[PDB]
Amino acid sequence: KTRRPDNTAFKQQRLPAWQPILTAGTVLPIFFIIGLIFIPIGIGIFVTSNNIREIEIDYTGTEPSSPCNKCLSPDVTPCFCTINFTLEKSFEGNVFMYYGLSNFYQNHRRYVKSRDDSQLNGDSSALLNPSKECEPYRRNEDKPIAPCGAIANSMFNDTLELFLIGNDSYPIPIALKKKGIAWWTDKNVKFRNPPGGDNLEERFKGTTKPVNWLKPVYMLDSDPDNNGFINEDFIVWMRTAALPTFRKLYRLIERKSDLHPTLPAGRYSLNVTYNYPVHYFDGRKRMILSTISWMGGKNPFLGIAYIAVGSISFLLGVVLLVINHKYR
Amino acid sequence: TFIPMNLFEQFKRAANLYFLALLILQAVPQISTLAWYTTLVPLLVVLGVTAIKDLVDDVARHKMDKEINFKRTKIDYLMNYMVYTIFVVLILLSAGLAIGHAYWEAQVGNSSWYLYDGEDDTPSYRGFLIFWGYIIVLNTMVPISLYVSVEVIRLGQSHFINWDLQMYYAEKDTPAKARTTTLNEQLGQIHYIFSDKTGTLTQNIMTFKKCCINGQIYGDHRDVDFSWNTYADGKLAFYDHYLIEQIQSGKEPEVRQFFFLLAVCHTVMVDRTDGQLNYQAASPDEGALVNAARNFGFAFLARTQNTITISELGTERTYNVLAILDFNSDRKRMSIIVRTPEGNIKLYCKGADTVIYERLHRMNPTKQETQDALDIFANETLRTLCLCYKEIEEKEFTEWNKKFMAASVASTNRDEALDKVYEEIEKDLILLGATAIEDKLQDGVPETISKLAKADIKIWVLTGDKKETAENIGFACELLTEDTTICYGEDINSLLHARMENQRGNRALIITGSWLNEILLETQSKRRLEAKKEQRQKNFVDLACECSAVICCRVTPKQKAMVVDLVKRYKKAITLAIGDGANDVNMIKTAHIGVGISGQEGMQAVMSSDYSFAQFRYLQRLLLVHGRWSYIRMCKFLRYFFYKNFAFTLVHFWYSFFNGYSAQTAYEDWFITLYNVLYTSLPVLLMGLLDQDVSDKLSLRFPGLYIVGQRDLLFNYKRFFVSLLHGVLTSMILFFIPLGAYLQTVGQDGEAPSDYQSFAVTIASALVITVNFQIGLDTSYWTFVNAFSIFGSIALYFGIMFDFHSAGIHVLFPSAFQFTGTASNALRQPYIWLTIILTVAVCLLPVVAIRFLSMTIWPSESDKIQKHRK
Ligand SMILES: *[C@@H]1O[C@H](CO)[C@@H](O[C@@H]2O[C@H](CO)[C@@H](O[C@@H]3O[C@H](CO)[C@@H](O)[C@H](O)[C@@H]3O)[C@H](O)[C@H]2NC(C)=O)[C@H](O)[C@H]1NC(C)=O
Ligand SMILES: Nc1ncnc2c1ncn2[C@@H]1O[C@H](COP(=O)(O)OP(=O)(O)CP(=O)(O)O)[C@@H](O)[C@H]1O
Ligand SMILES: *[C@@H]1O[C@H](CO)[C@@H](O)[C@H](O)[C@H]1NC(C)=O
Ligand SMILES: *[C@@H]1O[C@H](CO)[C@@H](O)[C@H](O)[C@H]1NC(C)=O
Ligand SMILES: [Mg+2]
């Protein structure tokens, strides 16, 4: 019929190969070695996370007796809460200020998609032609909404500030800087203003503000590098969270010039303009101050998980060892 | 052309049409939860790769035209059932979450002012709309590349049969061929083997040994070189002096007639140009018999339409040929009518004694001891062809000859009109004697018949040769040993009648074809007859399959395919038919796996088969190496293919709870595209082609490993839901370990991977590594390309993903590519890598522990010999 088949390693099923078999002397060391690797990492992360100092102030006022419950029914648009908290142990180094939102589904399909990417990327064509994707907020009355979409529309628009109550009882404001609170790529690549011109007023011609926003996107900040689509607060909002209960970076408190702690232990008051309504869907607002750590942030779950898995792997090795010993 | 290509790819295959129906679902925007990219690109590649496996054939056919001018596997049936099971599970889960979204929307969705879209859709409608949303996000449960991967697995495995060098016969220079590239796993599931005897269990390299005429047996040592005869050759080794001088001198009419018949009743074409009077016989019996006849001076020189050129001891006497009664498996005997120059019409005949003795003359004193002679030759595995002759009166021949010529009336009449002439003349026959010819078992057949029996393959042999020769050949090839209590049809017949009327180690069933029909007998009355037919037919198979061996004798081609059908219908056992010669093609088509020996009878019953190697000896490697590996390589492929796909989509089902059941994809939109084709497609294919539980030499030495496939222990309908339970858990771990790690702080600073984009990068990353590490656990043959594909899959993902999330690609598609700066930011943070390591360790270590316990507590035979390297 045909000639002799060629004699090559692949064709004759004779490729050189290692035949690993899960011998009792091979699975056991990896199980115990994992026990001696996860545990020290698990205790390492746990104690490192437990060292982090954090304070979470829930200032939504849903519960009665909180002395700004009036803001749940804001007859006057400007409402204010003054929540006092005292820190037992002073914060050291950079202190990060976040705002938290709970039971707030930022990962809804109708929500995450509702946005125009070319518009935020600084596309002139898409500036006056919002995509169909941000359908419910394409245009307000006659001309398109510049930050279209259900995401840019429902933006966290509270005004959080911190005061230090010293012995004199006079509130001393503590510096909060709004710059450098977004990913480098988001500021420098993903989000951009429309091209052309120098004044932001002339760039956004034929575009209104979103319906919920009180003021246009032109002057979200006085800094020319922080006004428009490249605004730090706005960018931090559009970065959709993965779960309902999230918290987003708001302000930074960098190291003080003096050797004293950045936030010395003492009486502080949180002066916040209650603008965001969340009590309709049982949403909770929180203000979170956290201190920087070299090994990420405060993640007690991983430390407990590594210890939990580290112990299971060590136990599994012993259990597997016993079974091998009996059935040897 | 190509337009027909996709036309039958879609309709014929349910999965291929399922995804086309999905594009329509993804086209409409009111329910499109995934982009159209997510289905075309995995579809075009699957529809593109399969085109290459068939288009290359057509273009070759087109070139051929210019130059010149069904069997479905058992798993193939299961695979269809799995895919129809995934549809139901997908429809139930999609309907289950559709309920959950309507109730979520009614309570939380309607009260949520941020999720306002301006479309007053009632919560019952919003749930309905997202029922199609979860037919799209969770669509990938149905494996798109299952139907293309299996073709590559089977094609590659089949091509190992062609390239095999141990399955290659040198002197005849014909390697093994696998002419069906879809029956590979079924070679490892064979329960029965039906084999021809002559040409399959014997070489059909024949030589004349003995003889008997008028009761006097010749060919023994009593009272040599044939130099006295010019036509003779030394190839024939004969030691019988008495017949040599008797035929040389003092010749008698008996020996003259007997040898003359062998050189007249033949049908062998002859050549004389070489000067040695070469012969080329289509039937080994005829060629050897004439080759033996010429050795004694009865040499056949030439033949034409009206005469012959036979020679007798140098006396070249030319006869006249009038009619030749053709031979077939039904007739079982050949005859020729020849007119001598004297003017007498002499009819010669030969064939099986069974059909010739019934037509003998009343006066035949040599009939009795000739039967004893015939039995004597069969005792040494010698095929016997009885002879006979008769004379036809001139007066009665005229009308018969005219009728014989009139029988050639064209049309289909010649099928039986000739036969009517055949039986109307063959009334009285004068016995002459019987021949004795030697056939020898192929090399390593007794090794194979013993080897395959160790794998619990019941070897049935279906042979048209005599009762005695088959029984002794069965003993010769170790098919029947000294422990066998043979029984015949009468023993079977009595048992069946006894039970039928009442209700109204090694054993054999050596039974003749005549007794095969007798037991089976081959408005209300018709129904009862059909009921009787099924009752006895079912009783026979249950009586036959209960014994290790079976010998079927005097069986025509109709009775070969019949028996194969009986086992198939009434036992549900996979069958293999191996044979040579046109008589076996009826059974090669009936059997699940059809094997064809090239043999000496003809190159005919191999093109009508599935595998066409040269010798029965090679059946050791087809089943115990290629068939056995092909089964485990296919099952290991399926046990992982469902896992890697059913553990991929289920994150969408778990993430549905923390997003309002809104059908939000936990993965990147462009990661769903490449996962099925790019990230987790190469390593599984390389497994199904290059995996070996034990070495080839060590799989022959332990045929018991074959049993894993006969009983179907490696991929049941039960092990489908253990790979799904594996898929559910892996998706549960892949989701809830990242979720637990992000509910709390995760590297939260100016560069914080806590958003959703870093949630898709973490789950997808730990998913790619987990499956590509769990395939590494599956492969038992870590060749230097299995490692490359496994690590290539993981390294490829981190290469493309960086490119996709790189700032440069953002220019090409600001909208379609919207993940920029996530991969280069979500994996430089240690907590993300501490979550991926934990998500992989806690997802793979339980598999290692589960696998190790199974080895230690319930070791399999494959593992038992793998532990002992020697
Ligand atoms: C801060 O954000 C909140 C919500 O994110 C803003 O409340 C929203 O205010 C808009 C009006 O600017 C409301 O839209 C419509 O207002 C008209 C009156 O012009 C009213 O008749 C409609 O019924 C409708 O409410 C919107 O409803 C309201 N949000 C909610 C949940 O009711 C708020 O104005 C923002 N404040 C600043 C200073 O940016
Ligand atoms: N040309 C031929 N002339 C006379 N008899 C023949 C013959 N070919 C076969 N026979 C005889 O017919 C009987 C059956 O022959 P058949 O044509 O059915 O195939 P077979 O049985 O020889 C193949 P196998 O041996 O593998 O079963 C045998 O007994 C044989 O002796
Ligand atoms: C919070 O601090 C303010 C200002 O010091 C004070 O007027 C108010 O009474 C304090 N409230 C409580 C509950 O201590
Ligand atoms: C809080 O901030 C507002 C706005 O700057 C200011 O008017 C007020 O005096 C501050 N202190 C309060 C409300 O106690
Ligand atoms: Mg045969």
Residue numbers in the entry:
A (entry chain B): 24 to 351
B (entry chain A): 106 to 174, 328 to 481, 493 to 773, 795 to 812, 836 to 1183
Please quote the authors directly.
Lipid flippases actively transport lipids from the exoplasmic leaflet to the cytosolic leaflet of cellular membranes thereby creating and maintaining an asymmetric lipid distribution between the two leaflets. Most eukaryotic lipid flippases belong to the P4-ATPases subfamily of the P-type ATPase superfamily (with the sole known exception of ABCA4). The P-type ATPases share a common architecture with three cytosolic domains that are involved in the autocatalyzed ATP hydrolysis: the nucleotide-binding (N) domain binds ATP, the phosphorylation (P) domain contains a conserved aspartate residue, which is phosphorylated during the transport cycle, and the actuator (A) domain contains a conserved glutamate, which is responsible for the subsequent dephosphorylation of the phosphoenzyme intermediate, that enables the protein to return to its initial state5. Here, we present a total of nine cryo-electron microscopy structures of the human flippase ATP8B1-CDC50A complex at 2.4 to 3.1 Å overall resolution, along with functional and computational studies, addressing the autophosphorylation steps from ATP, substrate recognition and occlusion, as well as a phosphoinositide binding site.
The ΔCter-ATP8B1 construct was incubated with nucleotides (ADP or the non-hydrolyzable ATP analog adenine-(βγ-methylene)-triphosphate (AMPPCP)) and/or AlFx to stabilize forms similar to E1-ATP, E1P-ADP and E1P conformations, corresponding to autophosphorylation from ATP and subsequent ADP release events. The cryo-EM structure of the ATP8B1-CDC50A complex in the presence of AMPPCP mimics an ATP-bound E1 state and reveals the ATP binding pocket of ATP8B1. As expected, AMPPCP is bound similarly to other P-type ATPases. The adenosine base is stacked by a π-π-interaction with F596. Additionally, D554 is directly engaged in the coordination network of the ß-phosphate, mediated by R652. Indeed, the R652 rotamer state is constrained by interactions with D554 and D734. Noteworthy, the D554N mutation has been identified in patients suffering from PFIC129. Interestingly, extra density was also observed at an interacting distance to the ß-phosphate of AMPPCP, suggesting the presence of an additional cation or a water molecule (see Supplementary Discussion). However, closer inspection of all E1 states along with the outward-open E2P states (autoinhibited and active conformations, see further below) reveals the presence of a density at the canonical, phosphorylation-coupled transport site of P-type ATPases between TM4, TM5 and TM6. Due to the geometry of the site with no more than four ligands, we modeled the site as a water molecule.
